[PDB]
Amino acid sequence: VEQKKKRTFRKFTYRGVDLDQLLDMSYEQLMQLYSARQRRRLSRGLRRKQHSLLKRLRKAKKEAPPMEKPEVVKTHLRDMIILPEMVGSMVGVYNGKTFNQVEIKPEMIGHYLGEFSITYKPVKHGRPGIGATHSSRFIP
Amino acid sequence: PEKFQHILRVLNTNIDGRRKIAFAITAIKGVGRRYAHVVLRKADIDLTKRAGELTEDEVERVITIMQNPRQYKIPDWFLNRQKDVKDGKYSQVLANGLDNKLREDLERLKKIRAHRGLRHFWGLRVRGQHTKTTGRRGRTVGVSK
Amino acid sequence: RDKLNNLVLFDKATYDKLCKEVPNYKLITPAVVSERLKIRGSLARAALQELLSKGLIKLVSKHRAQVIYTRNTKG
RNA sequence: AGCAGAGUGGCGCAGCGGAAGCGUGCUGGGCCCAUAACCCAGAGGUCGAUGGAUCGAAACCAUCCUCUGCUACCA
RNA sequence: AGCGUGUGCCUACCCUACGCCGGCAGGCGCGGGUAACCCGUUGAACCCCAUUCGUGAUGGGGAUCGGGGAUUGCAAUUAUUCCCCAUGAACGAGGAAUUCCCAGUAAGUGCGGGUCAUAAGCUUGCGUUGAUUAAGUCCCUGCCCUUUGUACACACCGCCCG
RNA sequence: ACACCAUGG
Ligand SMILES: [Mg+2]
Ligand SMILES: [Mg+2]
Ligand SMILES: [Mg+2]
Ligand SMILES: [Mg+2]
Numbered sequence: 325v326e327q328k329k330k331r332t333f334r335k336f337t338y339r340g341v342d343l344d345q346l347l348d349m350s351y352e353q354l355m356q357l358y359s360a361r362q363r364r365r366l367s368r369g370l371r372r373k374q375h376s377l378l379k380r381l382r383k384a385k386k387e388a389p390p391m392e393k394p395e396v397v398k399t400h401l402r403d404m405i406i407l408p409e410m411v412g413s414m415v416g417v418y419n420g421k422t423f424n425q426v427e428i429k430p431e432m433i434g435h436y437l438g439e440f441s442i443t444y445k446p447v448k449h450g451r452p453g454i455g456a457t458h459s460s461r462f463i464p
Numbered sequence: 465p466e467k468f469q470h471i472l473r474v475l476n477t478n479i480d481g482r483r484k485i486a487f488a489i490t491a492i493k494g495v496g497r498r499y500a501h502v503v504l505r506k507a508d509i510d511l512t513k514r515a516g517e518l519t520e521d522e523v524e525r526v527i528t529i530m531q532n533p534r535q536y537k538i539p540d541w542f543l544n545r546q547k548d549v550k551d552g553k554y555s556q557v558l559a560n561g562l563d564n565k566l567r568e569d570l571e572r573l574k575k576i577r578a579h580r581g582l583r584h585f586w587g588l589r590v591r592g593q594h595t596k597t598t599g600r601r602g603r604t605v606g607v608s609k
Numbered sequence: 610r611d612k613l614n615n616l617v618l619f620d621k622a623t624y625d626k627l628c629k630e631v632p633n634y635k636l637i638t639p640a641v642v643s644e645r646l647k648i649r650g651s652l653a654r655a656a657l658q659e660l661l662s663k664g665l666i667k668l669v670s671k672h673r674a675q676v677i678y679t680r681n682t683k684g
Numbered sequence: 685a686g687c688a689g690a691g692u693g694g695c696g697c698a699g700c701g702g703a704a705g706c707g708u709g710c711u712g713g714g715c716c717c718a719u720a721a722c723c724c725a726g727a728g729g730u731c732g733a734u735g736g737a738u739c740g741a742a743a744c745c746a747u748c749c750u751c752u753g754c755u756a757c758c759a
Numbered sequence: 760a761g762c763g764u765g766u767g768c769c770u771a772c773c774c775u776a777c778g779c780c781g782g783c784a785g786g787c788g789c790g791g792g793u794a795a796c797c798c799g800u801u802g803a804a805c806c807c808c809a810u811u812c813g814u815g816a817u818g819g820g821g822a823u824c825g826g827g828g829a830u831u832g833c834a835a836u837u838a839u840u841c842c843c844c845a846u847g848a849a850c851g852a853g854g855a856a857u858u859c860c861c862a863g864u865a866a867g868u869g870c871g872g873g874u875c876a877u878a879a880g881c882u883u884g885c886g887u888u889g890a891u892u893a894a895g896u897c898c899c900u901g902c903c904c905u906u907u908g909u910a911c912a913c914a915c916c917g918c919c920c921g
Numbered sequence: 922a923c924a925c926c927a928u929g930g
């Protein structure tokens with residue numbers, strides 16, 4: 325963790341627990357910390373063949389040489405509950421045309437994957453065109 | 465009738481002494497009116513005396529209730545901050561705890577650049593509202609060149 | 610908009626004026642006492658009820674919306 | 685260098701101490717099937733700069749600067 | 760109060776009583792209805808009666824935003840909908856212009872149908888409290904009939920002169 | 922018992 329407190333020796337947590345104890349929690353003990361939506365998504369949450377994301381995310385944090393990073397598992401699965409096991413990974417999330425890389429931070433916990441890869445360019449405006457105002461229309 | 469002091473300076477904000485005590489303390493942030501009635505009820509205070517008609521010892525009885533609600537038996541579904549994201553506590557942030565807790569929440573969001581953090585940054589609408597015909601702050605543009 | 614000043618509880622001058630205004634009026638409603646004096650109106654109601662408890666005034670009609678009194682039912 | 689006049693909204697200007705508008709232009713809207721004319725809203729101000737009087741000024745006084753007309757035209 | 764709808768032929772879901780649990784959304788349990796038979800005597804809102812506030816952007820108004828809890832679904836992030844605490848913006852009857860309307864009508868007020876896994880600031884119907892002003896005219900915008908004039912007939916949004 | 926009413930891919 326990259327700051328003095330956030331999941332550190334000095335006091336900050338997630339919901340009252342450390343990342344280390346979070347990796348020692350099971351989905352049931354863990355869903356009692358998540359907010360309501362993620363609790364419903366896990367309670368109902370058979371996660372049928374979303375488990376490939378979880379597998380391929382491991383087996384790639386393992387082959388990572390020490391003091392380095394894994395490369396990019398890349399996916400279309402925009403609605404994946406970020407779990408305390410997915411942390412530290414390197415993920416490419418589909419935009420609609422690109423895969424955009426996202427390094428996973430601990431603070432991303434309980435948020436959604438798609439929430440880190442926006443689907444459009446932010447607007448900045450041109451000049452109004454020939455139909456823009458009720459006065460603007462006339463050509464001879 | 466009752467011509468002693470009225471105005472009182474409860475923590476960091478000037479509570480006017482004239483209004484009914486319920487609607488008097490609402491001048492504190494984080495303390496709406498539905499929370500205030502509960503605080504006053506659990507404080508046993510009469511609800512037909514203005515802020516000017518309370519001595520210096522009832523007001524502490526009310527403050528300590530506003531600050532420590534969980535222990536005066538005000539249930540955990542009244543508090544405005546719940547399972548606090550950084551440490552799991554439940555409480556009412558009161559006066560500048562509200563400002564700092566909003567500030568920290570927006571910083572927390574922008575830090576990992578979530579889609580809401582960027583919307584707070586760019587100064588736009590964060591929920592799902594259309595934006596084509598609403599907000600509409602800026603100045604008129606002309607078609608002339 | 611201006612600042613219609615009003616008190617919530619009396620000062621001695623105003624309390625004297627209340628115990629002496631009773632005969633002066635043939636129409637005693639909360640509104641007229643709240644305007645001729647500098648009274649909030651939730652205070653005029655309480656003061657008028659207090660006077661009525663002293664038989665000083667006579668209640669001619671009370672409604673949820675509007676209340677009225679009279680002078681003394683005398684003279 | 686001198687006389688006289690002026691310095692205020694993009695531009696022409698009004699404003700005899702209780703203090704910022706007019707004509708036009710710009711942006712937008714109204715009217716008509718459309719377009720011009722006509723109608724209405726909005727933005728735009730170091731009242732040339734510096735001091736002083738006055739309870740108070742854009743206005744009065746003093747100094748300086750900048751435009752315009754007319755003579756002077758000046759080793 | 761009044762018009763209504765209600766277990767779905769692939770398709771795969773219906774309206775809900777009564778008991779219990781939870782502040783609330785909601786959850787569990789166990790019956791009725793293929794319907795003048797059950798929801799249902801459809802305990803609808805405005806209205807009605809009594810309490811607090813007091814001319815103050817106030818307790819008017821409820822935008823924007825933080826945190827949390829449920830239901831639908833294969834899936835809710837760009838927050839489907841829903842509930843709670845909190846935040847508390849413009850707006851003090853609206854310039855030039857311009858819309859609809861004649862009696863159970865205008866307006867106020869809520870309730871069903873459609874779409875509908877979830878679900879109206881829409882629309883289509885229903886009742887409920889219920890006015891002011893008119894009984895006219897051809898002025899304005901248009902319409903119908905006769906007479907009359909025309910260089911128009913793609914028909915005045917025409918044609919045409921320097 | 923007559924203000925102003927121009928034009929048309
Ligand atoms: Mg939708
Ligand atoms: Mg309807
Ligand atoms: Mg339905
Ligand atoms: Mg519906």
Ligand SMILES: [Mg+2]
Nearest residue numbers: 874879881882
């Ligand atoms: Mg529609």
Ligand SMILES: [Mg+2]
Nearest residue numbers: 902903904905
């Ligand atoms: Mg005819």
Ligand SMILES: [Mg+2]
Nearest residue numbers: 906907908909
């Ligand atoms: Mg003919």
Ligand SMILES: [Mg+2]
Nearest residue numbers: 907908909911
């Ligand atoms: Mg002919």
Ligand SMILES: [Mg+2]
Nearest residue numbers: 910911912918
């Ligand atoms: Mg011809």
Ligand SMILES: [Mg+2]
Nearest residue numbers: 913917918929
């Ligand atoms: Mg032609």
Ligand SMILES: [Mg+2]
Nearest residue numbers: 915917928929
């Ligand atoms: Mg013509």
Ligand SMILES: [Mg+2]
Nearest residue numbers: 716926927928
């Ligand atoms: Mg014409």
Ligand SMILES: [Mg+2]
Nearest residue numbers: 720927928929
């Ligand atoms: Mg021409």
Ligand SMILES: [Mg+2]
Nearest residue numbers: 919920928929
């Ligand atoms: Mg021509």
